[PDB]
Amino acid sequence: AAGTMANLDKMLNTIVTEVRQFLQVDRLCVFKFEEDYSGNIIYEAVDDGWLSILKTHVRDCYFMETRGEEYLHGRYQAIADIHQANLAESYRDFLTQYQVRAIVAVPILKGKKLWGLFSAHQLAAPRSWQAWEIEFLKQQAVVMGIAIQQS
Amino acid sequence: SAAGTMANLDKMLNTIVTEVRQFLQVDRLCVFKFEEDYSGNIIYEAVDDGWLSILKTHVRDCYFMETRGEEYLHGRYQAIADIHQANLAESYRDFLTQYQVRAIVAVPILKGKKLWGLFSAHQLAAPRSWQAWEIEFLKQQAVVMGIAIQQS
């Protein structure tokens, strides 16, 4: 009931806190999709008094049009410097509004469905993400997806 | 920093053990780290409800010392709902009984191709019918621990 949900919430939030300190990333969050693939930042660990985006609602028109279909088979984003990247203007603008300079975003699956994104943000300088860090983030997303599949 | 790399790995493994024990409602959750001779020590533990702690216990398990955990590198793991119903060596049954174990899951932690340790869940109050997703959850947490351990 509400007990199940409190238990999942605490586990997922602990993973976010865990991974943010271990990876030493400025901000780590979990973005959960609504039915229409709008979504909300529902867990967040941000260091040192920096910009919190917890409970921000986002209508990302890439996810809302694709329903995340491209994110179902190990696909992901890892950008060392969003200034350099050949990003869509509208996506660059979203990232800029939330102070992102470097990002890794991996999908969270509930069964065969895209449930959310697990996203690491640097807020000031570029970051050359390592293969192991991307694998760590993906494998923590698997952990989360198994726990989420129980409610 | 050799001091801070070890400290950050310690904080991460201790956080996983503490919160996974509460999430699965396990009586005792352990990380057993192997020495070069495949003796080992319990180096992280979350225990609740006034159950005996085995943190820092040294174990010379003669199965792991004789096999060097090779079977645990080729898909062996242990998931027993009630050790009273299982076929065990009396030596291994004595180990579990000493520490009040009634139900157990034990999965490998790898560092590259080497068996680094075991992630073990003990039920002490009662037998427990482990669900497929709980065994998968423990295996996948052991994967995440392995990736972190591989960095130092």
Ligand SMILES: */C=C\C1=C(C)C(=O)N/C1=C\C1=NC(=C\c2[nH]c(/C=C3\NC(=O)C(C=C)=C3C)c(C)c2CCC(=O)O)/C(CCC(=O)O)=C1C
């Ligand atoms: C309709 C314009 C528009 C608004 C408004 C908006 O919020 N986004 C947006 C357009 C595009 N988004 C594109 C890609 C994209 N969005 C995300 C979303 C997030 N990353 C996070 O960390 C996070 C949180 C936390 C969110 C909500 C991600 C990960 C991507 C990259 C998708 C891949 O390209 O992999 C995008 C470009 C689409 C493309 O390149 O094909 C546009 C136009």
Ligand SMILES: */C=C\C1=C(C)C(=O)N/C1=C\C1=NC(=C\c2[nH]c(/C=C3\NC(=O)C(C=C)=C3C)c(C)c2CCC(=O)O)/C(CCC(=O)O)=C1C
């Ligand atoms: C040399 C006699 C002897 C001593 C002493 C001892 O500690 N064990 C032991 C004999 C055997 N152990 C056997 C299998 C086995 N050991 C472990 C070890 C642990 N489980 C934990 O939870 C934990 C901590 C915490 C430790 C150190 C495990 C997981 C196994 C099972 C191996 C599988 O079957 O998968 C064993 C084999 C016979 C049997 O399994 O009963 C003997 C003889």
